[PDB]
Design a protein around this ligand. Structure first.
Ligand code: PAL
Ligand code: ZN
Ligand code: ZN
Lengths: 310, 153, 310, 153, 310, 310
């Protein structure tokens, strides 16, 4: 049965153009006629080693929207699974003999990957592993994009903000280079510029991209404006002040945005997107979040379900 | 003085008539410089039509005279405002706003870690005109910023 | 359909005499023949911004007793929804696009109200907002009262304890002045006396009330003795010692209590009610707590359910 | 009123004129209710003697017509103030600030824990007349407060 | 042998009119002609179990300005004393064997005195024992008044702020209550009222005092305006703002004050005194603060030197 | 009257070529013939609101080696100052009434100076104010160079490490920038580059500087190799390891260095300097560390003694 059936969703690099598409068709279906007891009797482990309430609450809602039971923890504070030498492997080993699938966010890279080497037959799912992958957000982005733009090809995507350290933005890029004809505009502080490996990757794809210094520049050509927050802490309170003013989206900036242009942001936003934007039809963050749901049970369904009946 | 009050704005005997204040700025001025806190008869014209600027603003502050200094601080807001000395029905001296060495109290500091933000400390910034803009450096953090930045926030 | 259908239960001042009555009839019915799958497929968000285990555990039991699914957090420690400028509005905005209704307790006044301005079509429910409202406790009190006394009219109610700072006691008062003929006896330390606005309100209602200095005074006339704990911290360890002895209920004090008189206390009690009282038929705190359940699903049912079929 | 001193015109074509504003209050009205945001000619008179009082603030907002709402907001600051509608250079209608029943976003809740503060919500207070003064109850914390305090907040 | 020789200063109610004068008298000479080698070869233990940096530094400077050595601590993190259960009685017994004088601040009432029971021949000085006493502070308060007003007798003393829980004013009233014809004005909110015992104590010794609603009422007849700080916590954060504004000194309020009028505040201040009051010549809390150094010096001088050749 | 009398040393940009010499000149004499009773009867408040044990101990030893008494604190746990909201302006105003000099380190920029506004006639010394200044440190840096190299003029100074966020080097460059013919070599990773303003400031005063890829390039022409520590956090823990190894001194790298070549490091070091570099005679950061005691002594001597009979 299904390609993604019984698979471990860890990195998006593992996920083919087709896989994304598959996920994407399912998500659209569960959004249409939701099937509440698809995971009936399954028990999922929501192991939030690094808490991520926004994400924890999302995934769990998803689990519940398909009638699945949930057990797990959040924040490694309660989690007495922090003895002196309590290895994640040893934890995963035991959890496997309790649950049907495990959803996990860890504060270190590849912990989800390691997790699978000890999960036995239980599929593991990465709700984030350090400064590496966060597959689920990417899938939630792509769906919102496709659902708004009507496609995932030839888009003029505008990424804004912390290009250098931004977990999500890296994966988003990765996904869209898996498609044909996308043009990227990278607007960011030189202090926080997109990694050369990404750019290096994009060239091999024969992918046209560009570095910009201010949103205005690409206000008009954009269809999808992805925004991210500028983590001040990785900046001097002063340079962050010269830099700030430069990269915040106000709605006055929207007067150029073509009709279909949508502004996304993994959330939370704070300084980067003003309340003015909130009211304009171009504003999509909150919607983007709601869709975190369908992209999520879509994945869950395919993974834990053989036949994709919808 | 042309004083064509066929209907728009007065004229007085003694005082100061800040003129050619550009667009919305005038309010800023009154606000920032507290020119409203006086028994005196201030009389403001806002968005007063002037085809030579489109719409300008005028603050007439009867029987009050601004010092070369008080004038100077207007450089950042209304750089081209002609302050006027009036003490006997006609002009006794015009004035062009000239950039000043320092800008106290009115500004705020772009650097949040500036101790200045919490204590009873009136802001103070040395002005330095460096090409295509003006650098302002806090008396405190000693951190230099573009006036564009110091003004935004 | 139903008056309270799709409504936001925030403040009891919003709630009419009739509304309370409605809630009160439903609660009595669900206590009679419980309907386990009334909220089947609904997903509720238990957002305990300020933890309140007693209350969290209660509401959630309620949610489960009507077959509803639950997702949420407790204590804003795990809740990584505490970034630098992470606004409650922005949180509520996103949560709305996940759940069916939100139950929330916040450490500040009107956060539940604000919550609704960003909840869209999702009803929000206040499980407490600072030193303001706590509708649910009041409804749980009133039911226990009605269930014990047989009515909510002409009662001689005795409030005891921290009248000045007591969240609950204020709302309880508010509710009973919505009914006819109740007489109130306010026994409290002058340091912790009932707010004049409340008293001021009660006069406009033409409501007879009285200030007393020791329970003994009204031992006999009372039907319902509401007790609350004296928060020592808002007192000098010494004045609290002179004051203490004065306001604790011992069972020897009960020899006068007429048969039907019941002693309620939102709980936890500590110094205020002795163990002696626990065994006397006049003792009702624990019962009061159990009823937190029916008053709670009664509300939940009406709110999230169009027709009130029971 | 309109400036027609010894001999001087200064009358508006069309629009609203707020007169009899207690002195030192005009500017508040000006900022508070952001009467400045406009692009129309606005003429203000600071500290202007009248029979009703030897000082008063006077604002004329040309081609703007204050909704009965706006008019009523002036009730907490300039009640004796009169609001005259001009059209064709003559008063086509006088009206006075009646005390409202709800004051929006220009007041600040004194309760330091009130959710309102940190959040993107606009203030709102249920206004109610009582004994010594007007009580203003916050929509959010539901706390009643003497407007004495609220304004002085 | 001078009176205060080898005695522990524990309570203000321990010192007589005579002893208060002798202490205020010695301080006058020290502030004039210094004795830097007076306590040379002395070692005063400075023990702050209650971190009181302000109080401490003054005591410690006082110490070093008399030629004495210091060893000690602050809080109970910088302290490894009495963790699982070692007693204070034990600590003292140990410490009073190596040092020459013990200055200690403790969070519990009566600590100071309990220490005098185990210190043997070593003098204990009380920097503060919770809500109880703090003579050293009062002493300086008295020296600031005597010095500004030229007399401790026949005064008009206004005491504004938190009168009930303010340990400093309770002390000042009792000291002042040992000198002829003092009249007192208590200006405090209903909830922070000068506790009755004191009020009783005044009445009994024929001493005039009156309650006022605003400091404005008495600016005129006032000589000394001792202001205290209302810790908002002792009030609900909303209750605080209503009466607050009735109790905050601003330079405008200063207009009708006598020439000699001085405003005092133990410190720290926060809102009760406007900064504009600093430029006003009546402001004297900082000068008050410095006199703390002589009051404390005088004391140390008297308790450790059999004869004060001054 | 000597120049530095009763002045607050706040910024390096406050001191002239003349003042830098006078400070480095006095230190030379102190290191030779000591003046232990010079500051006897002095009390310098040592206030560290930013715990800087290393910096502190040196200042405090400097103090005690001049005969002065000390009172003070560290962190803000050992401190009970400014909890709910007392101001720094207030703290100073209190403290500057009993002590003779105030040495303070604060985490916020400009604190030092704000203190000079409230200290009255008392000199403030800056141990450090966040990313801003720290003259005392530079002073010693200058004294270590002058002393090793015999001159502050005509040097080859290599500055390696975190150039952008390093407060110490920014200072050293400006001081060195007041003496004739200094040439500079900046060896820093792309992300930790000597911020432009400084670069501008050099260019403007005709001063030679160049960017290099490795310290190896210049070992030969170098006189002073001032190394700094790259806090890995300013880089992702993975980014850190790639360029890291380009910026770590080992004794092998030392082979082509001039005789006089000295390696400096403010301390602490962690990886940037091999321990094998300690046995090499160019290593001088510890000797650097000790000279901190004279630089600081000289200062204290100049700010508190009208005439330095030396
Ligand atoms: O017609 C009127 O409204 C009365 C009129 N007077 C005014 O309008 C005076 P004002 O300019 O103060 O509104 C007049 O009789 O001249
Ligand atoms: Zn600054
Ligand atoms: Zn409020």
């Amino acid at each position: 049965a299904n390609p993604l059936y019984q698979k471990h969703i860890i990195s998006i690099n593992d996920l083919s153009r087709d896989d994304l598409n598959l996920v994407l068709a399912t998500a659209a279906k569960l959004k249409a006629n939701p099937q509440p007891e698809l995971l009936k009797h399954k028990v999922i482990a929501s192991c939030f080693f690094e808490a991520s309430t926004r994400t924890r609450l999302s995934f769990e809602t998803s689990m519940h929207r398909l009638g699945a039971s949930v057990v797990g923890f959040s924040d490694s504070a309660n989690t007495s699974l922090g003895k002196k030498g309590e290895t994640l492997a040893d934890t995963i080993s035991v959890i496997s003999t309790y649950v049907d699938a495990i959803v996990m966010a860890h504060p270190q890279e590849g912990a989800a990957r390691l997790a699978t080497e000890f999960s036995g037959n239980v599929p593991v799912l990465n709700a984030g592993d350090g400064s590496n992958q966060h597959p689920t957000q990417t899938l939630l982005d792509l769906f919102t994009i496709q659902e708004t733009q009507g496609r995932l090809d030839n888009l003029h995507v505008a990424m804004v903000g912390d290009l250098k350290y931004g977990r999500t933005v890296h994966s988003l890029t990765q996904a869209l280079a898996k498609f044909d004809g996308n043009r990227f505009y990278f607007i960011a502080p030189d202090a926080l510029a997109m990694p050369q490996y990404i750019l290096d990757m994009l060239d091999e794809k024969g992918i046209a991209w560009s570095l910009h210094s201010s949103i205005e520049e690409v206000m008009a050509e954009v269809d999808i404006l992805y925004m991210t927050r500028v983590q001040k802490e990785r900046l001097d309170p002063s340079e962050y002040a010269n830099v700030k003013a430069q990269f915040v989206l106000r709605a006055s900036d929207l007067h150029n945005a073509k009709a279909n242009m949508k502004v996304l942001h993994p959330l939370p936003r704070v300084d980067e997107i003003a309340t003015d934007v909130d009211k304009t039809p171009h504003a999509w963050y909150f919607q983007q979040a709601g869709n975190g749901i369908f992209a999520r049970q879509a994945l869950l369904a395919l993974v834990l379900n053989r036949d994709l009946v919808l | 003085m042309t004083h064509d009050n066929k209907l728009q704005v007065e004229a007085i005997k003694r005082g100061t008539v800040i003129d050619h204040i550009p667009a919305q700025i005038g309010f800023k001025l009154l606000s920032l410089f507290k020119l409203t806190e006086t028994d005196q008869r201030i009389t403001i014209g806002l968005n007063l039509p002037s085809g030579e600027m489109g719409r300008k603003d005028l603050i007439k502050i009867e029987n009050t005279f601004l010092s070369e200094d008080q004038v100077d601080q207007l450089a950042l807001y209304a750089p081209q405002a002609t302050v006027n000395r009036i003490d006997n029905y006609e002009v006794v001296g015009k004035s062009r706003p000239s950039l000043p060495e320092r800008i106290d109290n009115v500004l705020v500091c772009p650097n949040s870690n500036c101790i200045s933000h919490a204590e009873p400390v009136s802001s103070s910034f040395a002005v330095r005109k460096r090409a295509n803009d003006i650098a302002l450096k806090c008396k405190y953090c000693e951190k230099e910023f573009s006036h564009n930045v110091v003004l935004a926030n």
